[PDB]
Design an enzyme around this catalytic site. Sequence first.
Site, PDB file in Angstrom:
ATOM      1  N   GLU A 110       9.587   0.281   7.951  1.00 30.87           N
ATOM      2  CA  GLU A 110      10.757   0.234   7.329  1.00 30.87           C
ATOM      3  C   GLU A 110      11.806   1.272   7.392  1.00 30.87           C
ATOM      4  O   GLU A 110      11.269   2.313   7.908  1.00 30.87           O
ATOM      5  CB  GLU A 110      10.522   0.102   5.692  1.00 30.87           C
ATOM      6  CG  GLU A 110       9.280  -1.296   6.029  1.00 30.87           C
ATOM      7  CD  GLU A 110      10.440  -2.467   5.343  1.00 30.87           C
ATOM      8  OE1 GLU A 110      11.058  -2.226   6.368  1.00 30.87           O
ATOM      9  OE2 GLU A 110       9.855  -3.245   4.118  1.00 30.87           O
ATOM     10  N   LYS A 159      -7.953  11.131  14.440  1.00 29.43           N
ATOM     11  CA  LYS A 159      -8.683  11.491  13.195  1.00 29.43           C
ATOM     12  C   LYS A 159      -7.406  11.253  11.719  1.00 29.43           C
ATOM     13  O   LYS A 159      -6.633  11.253  10.841  1.00 29.43           O
ATOM     14  CB  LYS A 159      -9.428  12.248  12.414  1.00 29.43           C
ATOM     15  CG  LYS A 159     -10.317  12.832  13.954  1.00 29.43           C
ATOM     16  CD  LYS A 159     -11.045  12.203  14.349  1.00 29.43           C
ATOM     17  CE  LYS A 159     -12.132  12.762  15.396  1.00 29.43           C
ATOM     18  NZ  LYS A 159     -13.458  11.486  15.692  1.00 29.43           N
ATOM     19  N   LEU A 191       0.965  -1.227   0.195  1.00 30.51           N
ATOM     20  CA  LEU A 191       0.093   0.512   0.011  1.00 30.51           C
ATOM     21  C   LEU A 191       0.307   1.600  -0.074  1.00 30.51           C
ATOM     22  O   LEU A 191       0.731   2.477  -0.647  1.00 30.51           O
ATOM     23  CB  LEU A 191      -1.103  -0.074   1.235  1.00 30.51           C
ATOM     24  CG  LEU A 191      -1.670  -1.151   1.643  1.00 30.51           C
ATOM     25  CD1 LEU A 191      -2.780  -1.200   2.208  1.00 30.51           C
ATOM     26  CD2 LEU A 191      -3.101  -1.097   0.041  1.00 30.51           C
TER      27      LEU A 191
HETATM   28  N1  LIG Z   1       8.062 -10.659  -4.864  1.00 28.90           N
HETATM   29  C1  LIG Z   1       8.244 -10.262  -4.383  1.00 28.90           C
HETATM   30  N2  LIG Z   1       9.184 -10.274  -3.446  1.00 28.90           N
HETATM   31  C2  LIG Z   1      10.006 -10.646  -1.812  1.00 28.90           C
HETATM   32  N3  LIG Z   1       9.376  -8.837  -1.649  1.00 28.90           N
HETATM   33  C3  LIG Z   1       8.503  -8.289  -1.753  1.00 28.90           C
HETATM   34  C4  LIG Z   1       8.114  -8.755  -3.367  1.00 28.90           C
HETATM   35  N4  LIG Z   1       7.318  -7.543  -3.379  1.00 28.90           N
HETATM   36  C5  LIG Z   1       7.172  -6.853  -3.449  1.00 28.90           C
HETATM   37  N5  LIG Z   1       8.420  -7.220  -1.926  1.00 28.90           N
HETATM   38  C6  LIG Z   1       8.626  -6.136  -0.924  1.00 28.90           C
HETATM   39  O1  LIG Z   1       8.287  -7.041   0.061  1.00 28.90           O
HETATM   40  C7  LIG Z   1       7.188  -5.888   1.860  1.00 28.90           C
HETATM   41  C8  LIG Z   1       6.654  -6.305   2.361  1.00 28.90           C
HETATM   42  O2  LIG Z   1       5.556  -6.610   1.230  1.00 28.90           O
HETATM   43  P1  LIG Z   1       3.844  -5.905   2.417  1.00 28.90           P
HETATM   44  O3  LIG Z   1       2.883  -6.245   1.548  1.00 28.90           O
HETATM   45  O4  LIG Z   1       3.859  -5.362   2.824  1.00 28.90           O
HETATM   46  O5  LIG Z   1       3.422  -7.746   2.884  1.00 28.90           O
HETATM   47  P2  LIG Z   1       3.837  -8.557   4.595  1.00 28.90           P
HETATM   48  O6  LIG Z   1       2.703  -7.824   5.313  1.00 28.90           O
HETATM   49  O7  LIG Z   1       3.959  -9.832   4.651  1.00 28.90           O
HETATM   50  O8  LIG Z   1       4.721  -7.308   5.254  1.00 28.90           O
HETATM   51  C9  LIG Z   1       7.163  -4.810   0.443  1.00 28.90           C
HETATM   52  O9  LIG Z   1       7.566  -3.521   1.528  1.00 28.90           O
HETATM   53  C10 LIG Z   1       7.890  -4.607  -1.100  1.00 28.90           C
HETATM   54  O10 LIG Z   1       8.573  -3.952  -1.330  1.00 28.90           O
HETATM   55 MG   LIG Z   2      -4.383  12.389  11.643  1.00 29.47          MG
END
Ligand SMILES: Nc1ncnc2c1ncn2[C@@H]1O[C@H](COP(=O)(O)OP(=O)(O)O)[C@@H](O)[C@H]1O
Ligand SMILES: [Mg+2]
Length: 303
Positions: free
Chosen positions: A264, A204, A75
């Site tokens: 992160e 909010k 997101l």
């Molecule tokens: N194919 C992939 N393999 C490994 N890491 C990825 C891939 N695609 C995206 N990511 C990275 O992994 C991170 C974690 O993704 P996220 O959607 O937050 O899942 P989770 O909730 O499991 O942490 C993202 O910030 C993204 O930068």
């Molecule tokens: Mg606010």
Amino acid sequence: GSHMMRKRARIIYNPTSGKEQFKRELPDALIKLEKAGYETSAYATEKIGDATLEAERAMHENYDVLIAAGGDGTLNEVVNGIAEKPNRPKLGVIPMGTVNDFGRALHIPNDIMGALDVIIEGHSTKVDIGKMNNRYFINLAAGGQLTQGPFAYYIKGFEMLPQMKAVDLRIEYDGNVFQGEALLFFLGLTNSMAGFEKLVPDAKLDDGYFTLIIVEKSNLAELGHIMTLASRGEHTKHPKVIYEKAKAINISSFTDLQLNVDGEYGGKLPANFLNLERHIDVFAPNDIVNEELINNDHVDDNL
Ligand SMILES: Nc1ncnc2c1ncn2[C@@H]1O[C@H](COP(=O)(O)OP(=O)(O)O)[C@@H](O)[C@H]1O
Ligand SMILES: [Mg+2]
């Protein structure tokens, strides 16, 4: 049978997100969106940043909706690609992550078809996002210095507080200045994480204000006291816990500080923050009144 003119949807999904279930459900998700009138295509991320790059491309491709299927990181990356650009597509959330703090804030259903139902019904709200220097965030920015690490991972409330070393900081917020030693600062957009059900009692999502928390230098008794109060959501009553609402927040220090942004590592100070008020139009359930929203016009009163 056919209630609307044909629309365009782009799914940006992380196949490694959460339980890694979404990819296998994609063909059925496409069926559902197509029956609802969306010409739907999909993009699978392969690495960090891919979702951002795709969202940037999608800006030139005239989409009605961008559906982000993944955790808060996915997101975050999608928002970073569309932020501050004209003719932004509406955002659909499929909360496929291990943690879904943004999804929880908007009461997005945690199942795929329920999340899709919310997008298809088409009711949406506008949420604030944060600008930090030249990047964006949707949940939280945190800062502080370890004694003698956890700023690379997901921030779980005040649990890292005993690890913090008091560091002299300058925080300029809407013309007001904090100058002194702090263990930690938080800039909250959303109001729920692992360690807090409520970071603050009255936050909010759409007020144009960050939730600014500054924990001042505390002795061992004040530390224990803050931790006790934090465990029952009364931390903002402690004199060493500053809580203010602010739109623009400029932070600096002559000493090194690690930064965490949406779970992160967000680099280094100095950092200028700006709340972009109601910047992102995002599909939300019409049957739930959101206490963290001032504007609930997306809600049908008869439901
Ligand atoms: N194919 C992939 N393999 C490994 N890491 C990825 C891939 N695609 C995206 N990511 C990275 O992994 C991170 C974690 O993704 P996220 O959607 O937050 O899942 P989770 O909730 O499991 O942490 C993202 O910030 C993204 O930068
Ligand atoms: Mg606010």
